[PDB]
């Protein structure tokens with residue numbers, strides 16, 4: 001149930017992907033297993049930053065494993081009090097508060113990595129906060145059993161897909177693009193949002209499709225209630241699949257304007273989106 005999605009964007013692989021896999025394995029064993037899928041974010045960073053600087057990718061691998069680990073505790077949490085404690089610990093860790101807690105150690109290493117461009121780091125922290133606020137809002141909706149529209153959902157969901165976060169990390173993984181990333185955010189935020197918004201919407205749809213019991217915070221179930229005519233799960237999937245292709249077309253059009261501002265940054269965003277989708281499909 002729920003089909004492969006054919007991204008408009010190529011899935012390209014860093015030359016040193018086999019180094020990425022073996023690093024992901026060793027580092028997971030050492031710093032995370034004491035508290036599986038997580039190491040397979042080795043192969044994944046390799047297809048997110050194919051024109052990245054290999055020397056930046058082990059740090060990125062560690063950051064993403066730690067992020068995936070903690071988000072698993074958040075998404076798998078019943079009550080707001082627990083989720084609030086983890087999210088606030090996440091953000092104080094992203095902001096450099098020291099910790100000797102293996103739930104947070106790899107996260108800390110990534111966010112305190114001295115090679116960050118300083119304004120890229122601030123961008124990354126601010127977007128991580130948007131991700132966390134997104135997760136808190138969605139949990140509260142599921143607990144309240146609040147019926148919201150698809151449109152309300154997707155606007156909340158976009159930061160919580162981590163697409164915008166992975167786009168900010170482009171500046172760390174591919175440091176030749178750090179300056180263009182800062183520039184576009186300071187000078188053309190509207191154009192930037194025309195790219196990132198359909199990206200988060202398409203990938204949020206893809207994510208929700210790929211986990212077909214989360215009834216008020218899955219866009220498939222949400223559209224089931226919103227729909228003007230009764231639809232079953234299979235018909236709701238069909239439509240949201242149609243929506244995924246529509247948002248990707250909107251994103252690609254927006255990337256043509258970004259590309260005249262920065263061809264390099266526009267290509268790196270394409271590669272993040274196409275590697276994300278390539279990997280989700282490949283983990284069939």
Ligand SMILES: CC(C)=CCC/C(C)=C/CC/C(C)=C/CO
Pocket residue numbers: 041044064067068071161162163165166276279
């Ligand atoms: C998590 C997403 C958007 C896709 C699955 C594979 C992936 C890109 C993992 C690493 C990125 C990350 C920061 C995950 C936090 O959700």
